[PDB]
Symmetry: C2
Subunit: 173 residues, 2 copies
């Protein structure tokens, strides 16, 4: 495989020339965030700000909730590896040139989500799930949840889902 | 006028309710921000753009937050228009953010204030980037043609940028656009 087979032809052309415009190349690879996971990650980022837990840097939480689904855009056993190498490629062939801190921190936050070596990654995955719960509920509000209270880690988002389920039982009747 | 006018009823029902689900209501308010002048997508591309700041003297966390909130007063939208957005941010904070995270309320209010009215370096950077990506938009559009172009959005860009770093980005971009038109 090759982690450029999905990078468009002309962005590849932009980066290959010596000392390219890595910023426009980024704002182009991102101006592709609409296929719409851009809204998804943005909404999750805004949601992270509501964590009561004192043991939280919600800034890293936003970082995680802004970069994690942003990997599966290009790209399982082969996946969460080759996704790792495409994140590697974006970090070291786009971000590392014109940004020192960002390449490192971005990769390690992507891992912090894709291995959950941090409480923030756990919160962000909890949110990727609980927002979808909200969406299923607000959908059937015009007319499936699957044990998802078990499928939540943290106690805080567990309580969020508990409130959501109370509202479910209110609605149906 | 008052901000409650520009708010869907379903959410107000979620709110004048005993044990209101403030998180669900916040998620609803966020889920109807998908709309452009999408603005959720605009703020997301902003959020990932601001991470490309290398002015070591900048809190890019506050940058990402200002970016992700600076245009959030937009479900509730002629000097009084900014009055309405200010009262809107305040209404959303005192009545939706305070009742579930008292600190996030004063974080969001002051991040929005740091943007629209400038207060920090992070605000300057986020504003410069809202202009920069619009410039990228216009250039890609102009590229999909032989030119014209659509000068008028470019006349005088390097003067609407306040930071050195984004001035540099914009200089590179204007160079490449002149290269396009030299063909
Ligand atoms: Zn997701
Ligand atoms: Zn903006």
């Amino acid at each position: 495989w090759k982690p450029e087979d999905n990078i468009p032809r002309e962005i590849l052309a932009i980066l290959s020339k010596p000392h390219p415009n890595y910023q426009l190349a980024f704002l182009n690879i991102i101006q592709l965030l609409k296929t719409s996971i851009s809204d998804h990650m943005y909404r999750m980022g805004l949601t992270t700000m509501l964590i009561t837990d004192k043991n939280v840097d919600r800034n890293k939480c936003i970082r995680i909730a802004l970069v994690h689904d942003f990997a599966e855009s290009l790209v399982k056993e082969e996946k969460h590896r080759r996704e790792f190498e495409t994140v590697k490629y974006l970090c070291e062939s786009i971000i590392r040139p014109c940004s020192e801190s960002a390449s490192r921190e971005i990769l390690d936050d992507w891992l912090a989500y894709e291995k959950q070596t941090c409480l923030e990654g756990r919160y962000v995955k909890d949110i990727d799930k609980y927002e979808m719960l909200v969406q299923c509920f607000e959908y059937e509000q015009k007319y499936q949840f699957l044990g998802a209270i078990n499928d939540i880690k943290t106690d805080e988002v567990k309580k969020w889902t508990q409130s959501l389920l109370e509202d479910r039982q209110a609605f149906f009747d």
